[PDB]
Amino acid sequence: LLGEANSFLEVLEQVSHLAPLDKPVLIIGERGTGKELIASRLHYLSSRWQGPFISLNCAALNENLLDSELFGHEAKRHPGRFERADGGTLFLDELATAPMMVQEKLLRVIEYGELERVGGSQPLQVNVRLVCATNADLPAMVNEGTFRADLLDRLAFDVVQLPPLRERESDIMLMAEYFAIQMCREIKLPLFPGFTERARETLLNYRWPGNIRELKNVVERSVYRHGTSDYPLDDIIIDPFKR
Ligand SMILES: Nc1ncnc2c1ncn2[C@@H]1O[C@H](COP(=O)(O)OP(=O)(O)NP(=O)(O)O)[C@@H](O)[C@H]1O
After folding, report:
1. For a substitution probing ligand 1, which of 33, 181, 211 has the most ligand atoms within 8 Å of its CB?
2. What architecture (CATH level 2) is domain 1-165?
3. CA 45/CA 14 separation, integer angstroms
4. Are 116 and 75 in contact (CB under 8 A)?
5. If you write DSSP's letter for every residue of 100-168 in order, what string do you get?
6. Fewer C-beta within 10 Å: the chain N or C terminus?
7. Strand 124-125 relative to strand 114-115: parallel, antiparallel, unpaired?
8. C-alpha distances in angstroms, 98 versus 71, 81, 224?
């Protein structure tokens, strides 16, 4: 993991303490800030490290498919993500998009340690360390009636706040350099020739709504379009759609 900003280093320290606990952890941060990477770090630093690490993007599925993907269904079986994570960790991304029906069912799994399994088959007991992520203001949603207060009262045992790249301004150039060098290797340039002051201004003044994912893409495209080691990279191509 790249980064020397104190805000980022404080996250890594927090994660090293939280990881060994079986308690649920909420990660708040923008897209591209490394939320999944942090969830993974929580699993690999925990006592569950040899168990499975399973992920699911709540925003990606309609209500009935999300219900079935998470909790499973009987119509043999399609095991849900809680079952597949048994003895391990389950990372639920974009939590704030989970419908209220899913949120209530999730609280039940957390409070009772089991999944309901219709009739015929006994309820399934599960043993899963939960990590969830979002960029929403969950307390505001609770006020608006779009997120369950009860779920949040129990789910947010602690909160990891990942800083956006624009608040780690020291790390922008560090990471840009790293990504430029890697792209130099990929296209066989002998040396990364540096960033001009204009390029640095462009990099540091942009707000990076896509954070680290967007930085890496921008920098790769920019090295490629530059295409030489003979002189420093001057043109940072933030928006490939205008040219
Ligand atoms: N500190 C870091 N150092 C190096 N690469 C990073 C760092 N944090 C994130 N990345 C990279 O940026 C990417 C996005 O990280 P990811 O963990 O998927 O972020 P995310 O916050 O979960 N984004 P999203 O899919 O929109 O929810 C991946 O290519 C990375 O490996």
Report:
1. 33
2. 3-Layer(aba) Sandwich (3.40)
3. 12
4. no
5. HHHHHHHHHHHHHSEE---SSSPPEE---EEEEEESS-HHHHHHHTSS-HHHHHHH-SEEEEPPPGGGS
6. C
7. antiparallel
8. 13, 15, 40
Work out which ligand 1 atom sits closest to the CA atom of 38.
17
> What 3-state class would DSSP assign to 185?
helix
* Phi, psi (rounded to 5 degrees) for 118: 50, -135
Which one, of 72, 127, 70, lies nearest residue 93 by Cα? 70
Return the half-sphere exposure (C-beta side, CA atoms, 13 A cut-off) of residue 91: 20
Q: Which helix (H) or strand (E) element contains residue 34?
A: none
6 CA distance to ligand 1 middle (Å): 18
The technique is X-ray
Give the end-to-end CA distance of the chain in Å, rounded to a whole number: 32
User: Measured from the CB, is residue 37 less than 6 Å from ligand 1?
Assistant: yes
Q: Which CATH number, 3.40.50.300, 3.40.630.30, 1.10.8.60, 2.40.128.600, labels domain 166-243?
A: 1.10.8.60
* Residues whose CB is less than 8 angstroms from the CB of residue 41 and which lie 6 or more positions away in sequence, other chains included: 1, 12, 15, 19
By CB atoms closer than 10 A (0-12, 13-18, 19+), residue 173 is middle
What resolution (Å)? 1.9
